[PDB]
Design a protein around this ligand. Structure first.
Ligand SMILES: Nc1c(C(=O)NCc2ccc(F)cc2F)c(=O)n(O)c2ncc(CCCCCCO)cc12
Ligand SMILES: Nc1c(C(=O)NCc2ccc(F)cc2F)c(=O)n(O)c2ncc(CCCCCCO)cc12
Ligand SMILES: [Mg+2]
Ligand SMILES: [Mg+2]
Ligand SMILES: [Mg+2]
Ligand SMILES: [Mg+2]
Ligand SMILES: [Zn+2]
Ligand SMILES: [Zn+2]
Ligand SMILES: [Zn+2]
Ligand SMILES: [Zn+2]
Lengths: 261, 66, 47, 242, 261, 47, 66, 242
DNA sequence: CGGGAAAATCTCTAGCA
DNA sequence: ACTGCTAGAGATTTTCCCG
DNA sequence: CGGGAAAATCTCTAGCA
DNA sequence: ACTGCTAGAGATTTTCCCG
């Protein structure tokens, strides 16, 4: 055992065995051989086999510059709906990006913009435009395009539709706007069987309607709840469960361990 | 006059996601909507989703049922 | 406490260990040699 | 359902509500309430108005949603048909544009604008647009000093008009009004799609004569025969096409 | 319906709607709208969401040239076991490849070599060496590296191990052979908890032993089988099933619908 | 019989239709304009 | 004298794969081995695998059981 | 198991077979048969031999597996310690090399070869190698005319010797013999690993005194006490470490 | 209740520098 | 302290539709 | 039979031009 | 007529180990 630990460490410093090889060759349990691997700095060469999950609030858009035919297309997507806007811009600068973003913020309720760390988006010009329109900038982790995985995917889809309509237009900007039309209104699927334009109208109208409905519900209902503790705030009650909020933590209790006032 | 608005707010459907599951769970029933969280009811289970993990729609194929 | 080995900036060379300042759903914030970095959890291993 | 239909039709005989109020009040499907409101003899969201205004020696294309007051303005480098068709293609890809109402100028009667309106499927027609032009020029004169170019001032005024000016009945902005109007239009289009989907079904119930289908559930089938609406169970009904 | 088919075709020629958009907008069933999409040549832009499965017979090796530090490493893998051989070659030519392949065929029983369409492997020199050693060449589909997905993966793994031992050697070829040592004998896992060297010894010894055992079984057993048909050949019988081979098709029958002679 | 639309040689442009000579587990052999090509089934759509 | 060789040939384990399943199925029991196919028994099911889809080993952790 | 152990031990008393025959004949685990053959008082696969032969003014390193006759030859550009260490690192990464037996030349006693043999874990020692050298030079003289360079002729002769020449008892080639010998060595190493794994367990059965563990199944525990092997059920046994 | 038919859902891939 | 996704193609499972 | 503990298995990812 | 895979990291399910 312990002699095996010494000999296994001294051979891991040569061969960098995995835990299975040192567990077989030196009679070690998997815990000890795993600890011999996990202490080598040279053996930590793989990360977690997961993916994250982007923010899909109703106010966050994702922006990216893509390139086609030697020209620059600045594309924005509404992350909750898939509604895109796109424009062929003459240059990939901060002035064109701030103009596109101020125009988009004038068109739709933009609350958050998520971009990569391109100079276009990182500039003081786009920073002043987002300060004027009241937009929050959320830059992704550098050299990690998966953080912008919606807009990058939409870049793919946009280019696909341009390849289907490129012979219908003489200029690239006409084909880009035709593809924006086709994506927003002539492609259906997703969560409601909607197109992206119908879906963004449903997302935003639902946000307005549910916000005002919850403002009307919260104004009437005032029931102090004592669960299991202290006085909470009642959020919801239905016939077997009660959802409350004590000290900014939204919890669900049964009708056992609850009493409302 | 209060219960009508509660039944109105339960008419909205929520498509949500869990923490390490990348697939979108189906249309739950919106019980409550907050500034940072959303209380839903999916398959007779009351869940609390973050706001950044939910898509709340009133599906306009409500012209058959609901 | 925790050791973080990570993959920083278009470099296949893994580096570390670093202190784990914050573990989030999807990414981590670490401190390597008084440099605070935000790494995706695909590009990080925490021990 | 049998409780709700008689209540809704006598309520329509009382004070003639529309089908949205009946589908909200009596838990009816909208096709049943639409047939209730459609059996009484006595019982716009795609129209945009375009113009070019002139300011600081430059040309601003202004498109107003007539039902909302929502505005889309753009400084164009020339008042030609190519720039008008590009603006119209952008607008048609952004919003559901069905009809565009212009002032019979030279850049709105172009072959290029006609080709763009044919491609996007827009009808062309030749105190709403100049009222919004005067209000937009007022906002541009307000926020001209906060920008260097006129394009930035026009987009800032479009932001302020669409989201920072609130008027009307409930005190909404033009963006909230246009998303409410377009959501109502999506509901109307989905209802008309479902009505068109079920009008080619005839049912035979309990036999008895051919009746129109209105709703087919999991246990019940709501029919209309001799201008009165009945509810039969599913196994007592034969639903065929015609 | 049919008017909807005409109008939906005429709008698909403009917008290239998917089947869901034309099924919603023109009252079409999914079969008709899917047929409108499936007849457009411009809309067939996605292939089958599958992967194939490489040959893993005990005699097939997969060869590839990889590059590290400005030098060329020619790597072979035994596909059934993961046993690798690798050598830093002075150039990526057909003479070095044919020398490496004749040497490898002299070392192990190589029956098939699977490569990409690199000039090294496509040459007349490697073709003459494989003709001499009796090796069958199986080139993959061009510009499809997934056909060589074993050796490409092993390229990855080999480079990983070189990055763990590069400071232990002064030259690259020493680090390459050290990594071949570590992969073949100091990494355990896979189907038997084996290293790759133990696994290739088990694969090849099992091939020899099972071949001679089946030659001894087939020589004794001669039972003409009539299933359900004609006279087959008995391959196996156990207590509820009988496996036979009639006209080069190996079938399994129950004890019902069988009779052996 | 069958129409095959495919993706040939480091080219994102899809092309076709072609006749399906042979469908195998993993790949297909097709004939486009008297040119016999072997395409992976990830890079081919058969109708 | 024949049955011993049959029990010997059933001591070999087969790791096989199906047509569109990319994951390796567990150690089956080798019933028969041919020039192009391999007859196995996995979970009381007699299967016929191609030769190119099977890895047949005598796992030398047979020094505990089998 | 209780049927097989008495049969195997009386069979060892009869004509003293080894544990492989007992584990094949009586369906015993190899640890039980190893303890049967190990309780009688009266009852190589990693050795390689290296040399340098000289042919056509060039140097050929030849390494022979002594147990098999399997050969690995390579034309090296110089008879130095660097080329010998590179050949040895290739051979050690290819096959399980445990001991290398050389002829105490100048290139086999180098510090480079010593460092390579230390890294790979090879012991060095200073009518098998020259017999294989003469047989290999005979094959090189046979197939020299089918190649242009001497490297190709050496690799062709290594192919012919390892796979196209069959002799010995059963008429096998050197490649079949080396994979049989190395598979037998893997079996021996796995058996010694399992024996080393269970020697630090002592069992108490039915109590009664400490006994050695030999096999632990799903229902039975095979022990050895007072140099006789018993089989107890699992619940009548306490297995602890020592 | 029960077989086909059809719809819905699950699985998986390329491409997005 | 932040984060892969999207749409299509085929397989598979569930629902429907009258007997 | 039953709870922790441990082993085995499932899920998923980067990198391989 | 040919074809993604491999090893590691973490989660999860199954087996074990004595009460
Ligand atoms: N590499 C960029 C990609 C890109 O690789 N895509 C492909 C891509 C790859 C994987 C994936 F999962 C999704 C994807 F899409 C991309 O799409 N866009 O937009 C980019 N935009 C800007 C910059 C430069 C960053 C500026 C330096 C930062 C200094 O702090 C790089 C990129
Ligand atoms: N692109 C090559 C790759 C390669 O992209 N790997 C990365 C890679 C990508 C995806 C994948 F799933 C597995 C992988 F590994 C690779 O690995 N090797 O070896 C290659 N070798 C030779 C040639 C050139 C072909 C000669 C022209 C053919 C004319 O007919 C190209 C390549
Ligand atoms: Mg970018
Ligand atoms: Mg991008
Ligand atoms: Mg290659
Ligand atoms: Mg390669
Ligand atoms: Zn290490
Ligand atoms: Zn009326
Ligand atoms: Zn099309
Ligand atoms: Zn004896």
């Amino acid at each position: 055992f312990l002699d095996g630990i010494d000999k296994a460490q001294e051979e891991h410093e040569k061969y960098h065995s995995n835990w299975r090889a040192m567990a077989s060759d030196f009679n070690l349990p998997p815990v000890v051989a795993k600890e011999i691997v996990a202490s080598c700095d040279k053996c930590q060469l793989k990360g977690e086999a997961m993916h994250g999950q982007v923010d899909c609030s109703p106010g966050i858009w994702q922006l990216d510059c893509t390139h086609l035919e030697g020209k620059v297309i600045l594309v924005a997507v509404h992350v909750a709906s898939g509604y895109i806007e796109a424009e062929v811009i003459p240059a990939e600068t901060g002035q064109e990006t701030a103009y596109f973003l101020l125009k988009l913020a004038g068109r739709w309720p933009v609350k958050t913009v998520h971009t990569d760390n391109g100079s276009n988006f990182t500039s003081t010009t786009v920073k002043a435009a987002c300060w004027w329109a009241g937009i929050k900038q959320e830059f992704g982790i550098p050299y990690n395009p998966q953080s912008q995985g919606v807009i990058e995917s939409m870049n793919k889809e946009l280019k696909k539709i341009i390849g289907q309509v490129r012979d219908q237009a003489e200029h690239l900007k006409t084909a880009v706007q035709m593809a924006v039309f086709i994506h927003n209104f002539k492609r259906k699927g997703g969560i409601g069987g909607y197109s992206a334009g119908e879906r963004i109208v449903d997302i935003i109208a639902t946000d307005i309607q549910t916000k005002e409905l919850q403002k009307q519900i919260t104004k009437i209902q005032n029931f102090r709840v004592y669960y299991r503790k202290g006085p909470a705030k009642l959020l919801w009650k239905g016939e077997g469960a009660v959802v409350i909020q004590d000290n900014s933590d939204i919890k669900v209790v049964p009708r056992r361990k609850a009493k409302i006032i | 006059e209060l219960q009508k608005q509660i039944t109105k707010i339960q008419n909205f459907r929520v498509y949500y996601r869990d923490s390490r599951d990348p697939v979108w769970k189906g249309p739950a029933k919106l019980l409550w909507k907050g500034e940072g969280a959303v209380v839903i009811q999916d398959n007779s289970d009351i869940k609390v989703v973050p706001r950044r993990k939910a898509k709340i729609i009133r599906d306009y194929g409500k012209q058959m049922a609901g | 406490n925790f050791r973080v080995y990570y993959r920083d900036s278009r470099d296949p060379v893994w580096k570390g260990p670093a202190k784990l300042l914050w573990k989030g759903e999807g990414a981590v914030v670490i401190q390597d040699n008084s440099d605070i970095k935000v790494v995706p959890r695909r590009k990080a291993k925490i021990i």
